[PDB]
Amino acid sequence: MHHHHHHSGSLGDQLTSTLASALTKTNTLKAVSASKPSANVAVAIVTSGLKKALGALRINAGVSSQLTSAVSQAVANVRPGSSPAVYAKAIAAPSVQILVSSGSVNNNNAKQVASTLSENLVREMANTARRYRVNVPEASVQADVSLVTSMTSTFVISSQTSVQMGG
């Protein structure tokens, strides 16, 4: 819908691939996914992490408001009983599309925002999950934050046309 066609790999495409991939191996997602709670609580959990993530990145309230509305829709569509792969994707897809449309993420900070957003999102997501019979030990959450962050730390956008006028 917002993604590009084909040339240098859309920025959102890579962000979602990594963001979803990391969240797919995060207890914060495997615990809630395996718990098979419900789209009702799942939406509230994701929103909690989205608010903190965007708030920590000084993201405009306007864009941060629509991002939550969309992310919640996708997450509320996957329905309960679905692997953490679909949930993470339903939160990154609508996140990258809006993050890129608002300029909140570009070909230079995407790695930073992806690490911080996921770091705060995963942390908050777990906190809320606890109230939904999905408690998570700080020992596990910490690993999820370091894992998602490490992935971005070495995130390189394979885009040929990435000239910012410098030569």
Side-chain angles (χ1 to χ4, degrees):
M1 294 213 108
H2 272 210
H3 57 83
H4 300 243
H5 173 235
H6 173 239
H7 243 139
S8 358
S10 142
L11 219 188
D13 265 14
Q14 314 203 25
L15 256 278
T16 38
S17 269
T18 338
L19 285 174
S21 278
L23 297 159
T24 291
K25 46 169 91 237
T26 53
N27 59 83
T28 302
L29 252 282
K30 255 179 282 207
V32 308
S33 164
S35 259
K36 193 249 216 297
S38 21
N40 324 118
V41 318
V43 170
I45 294 163
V46 56
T47 35
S48 309
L50 244 53
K51 299 150 121 219
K52 180 94 153 133
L54 304 154
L57 273 141
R58 295 95 136 73
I59 302 303
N60 154 51
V63 56
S64 143
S65 141
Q66 58 186 28
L67 191 122
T68 37
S69 290
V71 170
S72 47
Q73 179 80 231
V75 178
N77 279 330
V78 57
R79 113 184 167 191
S82 333
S83 241
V86 284
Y87 275 97
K89 185 265 292 260
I91 302 161
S95 267
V96 296
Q97 74 179 229
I98 281 138
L99 274 176
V100 70
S101 267
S102 186
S104 287
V105 304
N106 358 254
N107 306 60
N108 240 78
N109 152 78
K111 47 159 78 145
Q112 230 113 332
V113 57
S115 129
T116 315
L117 169 120
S118 63
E119 163 155 19
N120 288 272
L121 168 147
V122 72
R123 164 179 183 164
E124 241 46 59
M125 273 236 286
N127 281 310
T128 337
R130 320 221 288 190
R131 314 168 83 188
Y132 300 115
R133 226 269 204 281
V134 195
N135 158 92
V136 177
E138 212 60 68
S140 274
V141 188
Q142 53 108 309
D144 279 355
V145 166
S146 287
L147 163 147
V148 300
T149 48
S150 193
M151 292 259 264
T152 77
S153 264
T154 39
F155 170 77
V156 176
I157 310 180
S158 303
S159 59
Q160 198 67 274
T161 47
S162 45
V163 185
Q164 52 245 84
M165 194 208 206

